[PDB]
Design a binder for this molecule. Sequence first.
Ligand SMILES: [Zn+2]
Ligand SMILES: [Zn+2]
Lengths: 258, 248, 99, 115, 149, 66, 60, 78
Amino acid sequence: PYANQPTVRITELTDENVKFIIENTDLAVANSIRRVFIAEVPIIAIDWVQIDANSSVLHDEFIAHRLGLIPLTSDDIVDKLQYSRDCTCEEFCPECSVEFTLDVRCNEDQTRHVTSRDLISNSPRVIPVTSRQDDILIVKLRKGQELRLRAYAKKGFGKEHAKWNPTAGVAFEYDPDNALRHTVYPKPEEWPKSEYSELDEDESQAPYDPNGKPERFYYNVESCGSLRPETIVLSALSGLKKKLSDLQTQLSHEIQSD
Amino acid sequence: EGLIDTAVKTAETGYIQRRLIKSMESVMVKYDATVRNSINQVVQLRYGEDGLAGESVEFQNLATLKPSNKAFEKKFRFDYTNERALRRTLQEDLVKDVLSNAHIQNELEREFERMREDREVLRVIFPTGDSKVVLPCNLLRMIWNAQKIFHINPRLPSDLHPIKVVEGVKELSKKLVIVNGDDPLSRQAQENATLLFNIHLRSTLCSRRMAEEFRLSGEAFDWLLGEIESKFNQAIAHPGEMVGALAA
Amino acid sequence: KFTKRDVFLERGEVMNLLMFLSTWDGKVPQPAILKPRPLWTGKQIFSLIIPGHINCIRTHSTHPDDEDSGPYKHISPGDTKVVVENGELIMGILCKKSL
Amino acid sequence: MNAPPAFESFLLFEGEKKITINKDTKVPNACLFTINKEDHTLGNIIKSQLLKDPQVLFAGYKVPHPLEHKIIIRVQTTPDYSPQEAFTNAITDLISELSLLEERFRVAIKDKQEG
Amino acid sequence: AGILFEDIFDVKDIDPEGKKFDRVSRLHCESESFKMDLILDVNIQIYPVDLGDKFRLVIASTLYEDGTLDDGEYNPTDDRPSRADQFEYVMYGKVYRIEGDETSTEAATRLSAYVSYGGLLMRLQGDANNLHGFEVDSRVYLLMKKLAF
Amino acid sequence: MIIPVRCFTCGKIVGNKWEAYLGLLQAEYTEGDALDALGLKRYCCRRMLLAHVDLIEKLLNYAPLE
Amino acid sequence: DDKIHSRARGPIQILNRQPMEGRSRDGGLRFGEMERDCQIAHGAAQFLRERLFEASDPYQ
Amino acid sequence: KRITTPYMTKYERARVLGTRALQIAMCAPVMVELEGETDPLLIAMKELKARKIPIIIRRYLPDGSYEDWGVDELIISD
Ligand SMILES: [Zn+2]
Ligand SMILES: [Zn+2]
């Protein structure tokens, strides 16, 4: 009547994605961890743009929309900043936000390519993905136009908006061989073998297994560039643990009050 | 072609419906249990020639319709000579009563004669042998529900004398009234209106079928009569219902 | 597809489906297959959805006509001839003819 | 024009409780836990963890309406084991398992880098 | 006791009219002593069975030895003795029709119990002597165990 | 009108690849090879470089001044 | 958003004192004759008279 | 010598419930103990179930005559 002892094994560690495997765990925990990977992951992003002079051809809101989708590295800044909603001051304080500025005006004859590199941030570590591969093209300006504005970044998670979605695409998969029969193939021979399939090329699918629980969940968390993959996993685990702790505290208070 | 057909239908059916609705917009069922119009002109002495709402009516079948003369005799007569069959169906304390007593035999003979008369009436009224008919109360469903509730277990000898069934049916034939009044014309109209339903009730509830296929007990039969009367009462057409608009 | 003969559910799925029942009496029905593992059946779960003690008989869309006359009338190989007693599905597959 | 904002999915409103206990009357030892501003993330793991415990006769959640941010969890244990302590134990052991999983993942990562 | 029926059987034909479903098949079995037919429907997926295999089918009204007539509800937390401990395939259903070759004068000689285990049917056709314990609208079990022989 | 910043389905950044895609297509490479040369595995992110229409050029043709 | 519309004693016409017509003019929906026939079929005379007099154009 | 049906039609039941609800909403005395509710329509329904509505229905006949039926006199359908 207690929990289990899951095991972890990393198969590929790179600076763009990680492929780890979790064994001896329930399917619900795995799916919840996935949904947390996608939705509930603190990360910094643009959420407040003040446009002062925009003579481009696109809409006034188009600039803000594109700026909202530009990732920002937050390897060691997201854990320090606090949510703007829970701040105890006025105006976007640097202790709970990061300021940006963009002032580009096409003067020469050739057309400008306003990229993310023009976003001059006040903080050193909070910069768009341009450290170490072109830069995110914002808009194109021509001789006579300009784009002056300044925006602030705040902490948020994907559940609020897609801008705070660090993971590009999580490849969640378990039981490569259709052993638990969770999916019935009308013609198994017509389907290809999964990447993690241990079954030989002769047999189409593994035989049935009545007394068998789902284990060996495969993951392929792919970072967009802002947060590192392993960092994303650690943040997700910490956030889920915090949510459970808060729920436990609320339940204890409710029981004591009754 | 299909699109053009749909367009013309969408334009013609509206006018058809409008004309149908503007011709029977004042017809209704007054509290005198009769259908009239704004000029108080009687169009039907009883709504739908019976005076029943169209919501509480289900398709049924007439067992005593389109039989064979030999089969009809061996399904609604309740032979009182084969004592072995009676012991199999009725209990020991009823076989002697149905044998010795001749009043029960005369009553059963009269019931079979009335059943034959009803069969002749159905044949002369429903030509081409159409068993599928619409009536308020689905007696088969009610009998099945009684069996499933009271746990009839149709294998053991049931305790239900045929006279009980006969008297119960006669009383239910009296309780279900449509044309109130003791006037001879009133009674004639009541018999005419509630004619098919009574024929169906008699055909389903008999002395033989009740003791061979249903095997209901006294309490079960009483509950069946109560349910039938309550459902028929609820099935009556509510006065003040705009039947003209419903028909349109 | 939920009322076919070849439908089996585990305790987790059954208890998850019962949550979406506004008239559940609060008692888990006896599984149709106790051993080697508690497995419920689609018809058994659907019985709890039927209120009261209803009794009716209906026929399935793919019901072969040459079945009532011959044997296997009350036991249909194709899982047809819907039969409901005491508001519990017993035989047949539900379709538009019955729902 | 009437689209709700994005903070109403996780943030509590003034006066709304995060969790409310309500005892059921149809069967003994059965309570429905109603959670506010949550989704399947925080109910499916608890459902499974409760399923692990043998003393829990029934366990399962639901979503009264997808647009509404609320989930009801119904738990029913043996008469000698109240559902409150069952929920508490499920949360506690789940937290312990997640912490252990995090530690194992961290050590595996630190060993993977040049090792 | 509550043993409504007890007899050994053997498989002789599976899905004669072609396997319709994918997890259920017809088992046209026969007895060895009472000479009674059997059209049991077992879950071939979890409990595979081939031709020629024998099993000890025992229709029991309850799973307890003392016979306390359980109400009927899933209560795994129970330490009481259970007859299922020596059977590899148990089911729970409710007989709904007892057909027989009855007549207007002489009692029936061969009955036919039709029981539905929530969708899985079974016809225990045979003489009318050993089927005295079957009554319409009553809960029953199966309790079958394959014989190694 | 302009290349999006991220893929609608997946979410991977694709805004910083339009110029590289055009350059690779211009040099010698074809589309089927350039897409996997840039690092686009999933087929959902490959539509952003194949389906996208570059209408910002026509808009820039209407220069306000000079 | 371009189709959603509501009304609560909005502006009235000048010829026949009845609600306006059109979402832009902030008008009410038309209670067509077919709706009247349906309401008569339901026998809800009170609701019909309310819709046709009380919330349409009261006058003494 | 009343010949109208002894059952309450749905139309009459609905109208009586509505009228009693309107009267209750206009600060009128109730005819049943309130278990802690406030909606006048619910109170009217409870009174109808308790057969204590002080209203009598006058069913007009086609000829011109009428019959006065009391709510506590005839049988209620629902
Ligand atoms: Zn601040
Ligand atoms: Zn994509």
